Amino acid sequence: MRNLITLNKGKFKPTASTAEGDEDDLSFTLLDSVFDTLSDSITCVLGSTDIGAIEVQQFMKDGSRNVLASFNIQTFDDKLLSFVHFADINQLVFVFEQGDIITATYDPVSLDPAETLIEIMGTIDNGIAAAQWSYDEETLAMVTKDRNVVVLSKLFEPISEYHLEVDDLKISKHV
């Protein structure tokens, strides 16, 4: 038994943070999002692929569309590989394709930008393929475009790395 049903279909559209009256569409397509378990909200992200203009907003349950950060990227065109948020330190970490490992540290009180800190912990040569934050947020892993996997702590020191190769699959099959 145990049929599965739907209880709610709550949905909306994340509006952009207008700066000069350009309230219309700026091709501010959604990039990624993450559940805000510490406040029961959504930390949505909407960015532009032409200028690098990205706005990350903590969409509160009550409707407080708090734009926690907004800025531009050096490569400004490479895809946002991944994104997550840290509650204890109140950080927003983004990982882009080209190695733009960006950390945005905001203030609990003043959620306006320019009151934050934007840092680049490091870059990956010749870009990255994919990355995925650990469910405990204690480590992060990715692989370079040239098959070199790297794993590193949440303080962004390289835990280890391993050049992904072709021979290994050929030896550990046992068919």
């Binding site: 049903i5 739907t6 209880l7 709610n8 279909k9 709550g10």
Partner: protein
């Protein structure tokens, strides 16, 4: 009656019937006796979500809209061609029915 079963396909309801409980026992599985497309009773509405019955005389179809939800009532007498009862509206988001 335990003899009519409803199913919600996207934009259509399927009503299946078995002549009697005993005929269910003997092996005659319930057969599709009626199909009522959503467009046939509402030529365009958002999407149906859940369904229930009333005394084997009425059907309540809970569908969700962008803000609220609509409970459409259907009469199962003359199963082949059911008639649309008033589509009642609740000004809140129904989660269960």
């Amino acid at each position: 009656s335990n003899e009519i079963y409803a199913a919600i396909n996207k934009d259509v309801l399927i009503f299946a019937a078995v002549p009697s409980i005993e005929e269910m026992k003997k092996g005659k599985h319930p057969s599709i006796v009626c199909e009522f497309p959503k467009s046939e009773f509402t030529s365009e509405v958002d999407s149906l979500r859940q369904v229930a019955f009333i005394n084997d005389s009425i059907v309540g179809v809970l569908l969700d809209t962008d803000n609220l939800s609509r409970i459409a009532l259907l009469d199962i007498q003359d199963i082949t061609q059911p008639t649309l009862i008033t589509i009642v509206e609740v000004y809140d988001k129904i989660v269960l029915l």
